[PDB]
Chain A
């Protein structure tokens, strides 16, 4: 709730919107709007990393009490992170959910939006910080330390039969005067079975970043159509239930339509140009039905391709055979779908949905929205987001990271669109440059298993694959690629790694972790899994991202680290 706490929000603030994300911008531009509405000046921020965050707060060494960060938080007992915080108001709203408890407790400078059907970690603080063994926060028999310290009367207090609290059992000795430590460790470790179940085996994401924010601003009587679209963007990023889960899809078909359909501000007069209120339809995650012909865009998506195996010829043969049953002309299969004639381009999906039921594909259609600004053309559900990811354009000017962020947030207006087509173009060329490596690497047989996983390494830098989003995308097209056709049915289920050269950064051999096949809810080990070898030998590793599934190494200090990381 903040139908009460929002009424705190008038004084000065800082609105930080942590490292690059589509949840980020969609969730934050609305609040920029909200906050120049009630006549507040504030601060939006680019985040380059947790160090970027810490210097940022360092540069804002004031007493801005209404500090705000969003889509982060699980890093420390962040009073340890952020010492000078005294009673300063922070707000966490992150869906990176497996977060510390010291950030949850200490009801001082934090917002426990603790609301979940998992009441599983209640004494998770009641024994690690509250108990201790072989400790110094205590007294001694001598008269020089005759003062009572922060006596928790627990293992946090002494273990020499000095514990006024801890009134479950005997006092002097259970079997010995220090069986205190024995039972302390019993509970400690027997329930580190569940502490190590947290944060040291697996990570995930939770819920939205900004649909809660839509309901917040909905209670103040705003029917901002565009805010529905921006939140739609925020979700349709990791609506990708194979990437990171939505789940609620068939429940949000009630939720969001109920937000928007039932309140019909015009039921009879809406046949107008500007922003004719949003609609909903059941369509695909075929990449880019609209502005391209079929036959290139039927070819660069993984799911349409992997099930029909087109990077070899034979897939094209069966492809043509299904265009045959579809009876699309090849010319028409090479003019833009919109550039087609009428009747075919109307009936296209109408036929494809039902007579693809019978030929190896079942999971291409979705439920989404689309709308006009005017009479130019009818933009698409995600063709923003696949234009966005192409704006992470790590050029060597050193300004372009933050500048491309600022550009991106200045994109989803109804105004700036000469760039949006730019994003489309950039996206397409990268999208088929993805495919351009798979044939090279598959049929060169670069699929290094090397034991319990599959593994890739690469050799030099591409501007595609300088940054790691494209890298995860590489790994997540090859994987299906190889494991369709080179295997029996036994070994299709193992995880994957991939090197990522950075000729820019003096030689670091970046990596990204990614998971085996077809287990949507059973997600990453790699919330910590890499860190094993970090303990065993341990060499210059990083975990800088609030994204977990990533590292950054030296050019060449990986292989032995990998041999340790065999297990």
Chain B
């Protein structure tokens, strides 16, 4: 729109306009430094974001999903436009945040926190190993023997259009094991620390999702700080019910931070 175009423009006229470190801003060059090491995990400052334009604190929680998407789109359209040399290897991006003036302990988050901006910590426990999932929907026709084609995918929902090279026909189908896009996976099970309990009873816990960029960093019993966001499996079997819906809650990680972080770590001041 007129205004709904200006989101990406604000990012563009942010990353090379809001400048500190005595000139020659990070996000002028920090993105270059991300492309250099082949990471694709650029991270953003909420502090600096508010120091530029406060506006995108309220325009986030109504759908932080679309905020993050409309950001990383800008990272591509900048990178491959100025670094078309990049356009072989990965050519896909998403960004992170590390400034949220809040720690929500566990046993603190409830129905108001639904599907919006979050922070919390805890302790790791046993979880899964290393697996991928899918990323794109494509099958194979057999009435005409064609491909159904690739189809636009919703987060956990079916598509099934009639349009396809088989005279837009062939309701039935089969599926291949290739020509389709993949995505690593790993899980976590988060517990709360033995210091900040309610002083003597059993503790609480909920589970957390990490994604293909995010695996083989955690371990059982490790130190941590994560933004994450509040999930909802939208149906853990609604019907003629219990005395209670069998619902659950997860957090999906955007930016995980280790609070030990025993590697060579810090950025550089300019001088």
Contacts and interface: CB of A to CB of B under 8 A. Distances in A.
Contacts of A327: 83, 85-86, 88-89
A206 interface: no
A193 interface: no
A362 interface: no
Contacts of B35: 324
B38 interface: yes
A517 to B, nearest CB: 33
A320 B88 CA distance: 17
Interface string A296-329: 0000000000000000000000001100111101
A330 B38 CA distance: 9
Contacts of A329: 38, 88-89
Interface string B23-42: 00000000000011110000
Interface string A37-61: 0000000000000000000000000
Nearest to A329: B89
Contacts, number: 18
Nearest to B87: A327
18 contacts: A320-B36, A320-B37, A321-B36, A324-B35, A324-B36, A324-B83, A324-B85, A325-B85, A326-B85, A327-B83, A327-B85, A327-B86, A327-B88, A327-B89, A329-B38, A329-B88, A329-B89, A330-B38
Contacts of A324: 35-36, 83, 85
A330 B36 CA distance: 10
B14 to A, nearest CB: 24
Interface of A: 320-321, 324-327, 329-330
Interface in B46-89: 83, 85-86, 88-89
A324 B31 CA distance: 13
Interface of B: 35-38, 83, 85-86, 88-89
Interface centre among A320, A321, A324, A329 (most CB of B within 10 A): A324
A415 B86 CA distance: 45
A320 B32 CA distance: 12
A321 B35 CA distance: 10
A325 B32 CA distance: 11
Nearest to B35: A324
Given A325-B85, A330-B38, 16 more contacts: A320-B36, A320-B37, A321-B36, A324-B35, A324-B36, A324-B83, A324-B85, A326-B85, A327-B83, A327-B85, A327-B86, A327-B88, A327-B89, A329-B38, A329-B88, A329-B89
Nearest to A326: B85
B40 to A, nearest CB: 13
Nearest to B84: A327
Contacts of A325: 85
Nearest to A343: B88
Nearest to A324: B36
Nearest to A332: B89
A321 B85 CA distance: 12
A329 B86 CA distance: 10
A137 to B, nearest CB: 82
A198 to B, nearest CB: 57
Nearest to B89: A329
Which A-B residue pairs are the 8 nearest by beta carbons? A327-B85, A324-B36, A329-B89, A320-B36, A325-B85, A327-B86, A330-B38, A321-B36
A320 B38 CA distance: 11
B76 to A, nearest CB: 16
Contacts of B85: 324-327
B189 to A, nearest CB: 33
A324 B33 CA distance: 10
B92 to A, nearest CB: 15
Contacts of B37: 320
A77 to B, nearest CB: 67
A174 to B, nearest CB: 82
Contacts of B38: 329-330
A329 B85 CA distance: 11
A191 to B, nearest CB: 65
B71 to A, nearest CB: 23
A327 B84 CA distance: 9
Nearest to B32: A324
B87 to A, nearest CB: 9
Contacts of A321: 36
A11 B203 CA distance: 105
A330 B88 CA distance: 13
A320 B33 CA distance: 10
Contacts of B36: 320-321, 324
B24 to A, nearest CB: 15
Interface centre among B35, B83, B86, B88 (most CB of A within 10 A): B88
A212 B83 CA distance: 53
B262 to A, nearest CB: 21
Contacts of B83: 324, 327
B57 to A, nearest CB: 35
A343 to B, nearest CB: 9
B16 to A, nearest CB: 19
A329 B36 CA distance: 10
A326 B86 CA distance: 9
A324 B36 CA distance: 6
A326 B88 CA distance: 12
A83 B83 CA distance: 76
A330 B83 CA distance: 17
B63 to A, nearest CB: 35
A324 B83 CA distance: 9
A231 B86 CA distance: 44
A533 to B, nearest CB: 52
A378 to B, nearest CB: 26
B28 to A, nearest CB: 15
Contacts of B88: 327, 329
A326 B38 CA distance: 14
Nearest to A320: B36
Nearest to B85: A327
A519 to B, nearest CB: 39
Contacts of A330: 38
A322 to B, nearest CB: 11
A406 B18 CA distance: 71
A314 to B, nearest CB: 13
Interface centre among A320, A325, A327, A330 (most CB of B within 10 A): A327
A321 B36 CA distance: 7
B157 to A, nearest CB: 36
Nearest to B88: A327
Nearest to A321: B36
Nearest to A330: B38
A262 B269 CA distance: 64
A18 B136 CA distance: 72
A324 B84 CA distance: 11
A345 to B, nearest CB: 13
B35 to A, nearest CB: 7
Nearest to B37: A320
A351 to B, nearest CB: 10
A325 B38 CA distance: 13
A137 B35 CA distance: 87
Contacts of A326: 85
B171 to A, nearest CB: 41
Contacts of B89: 327, 329
B217 to A, nearest CB: 20
B140 to A, nearest CB: 28
A330 B37 CA distance: 9
Nearest to A344: B88
A327 B86 CA distance: 6
A321 B33 CA distance: 9
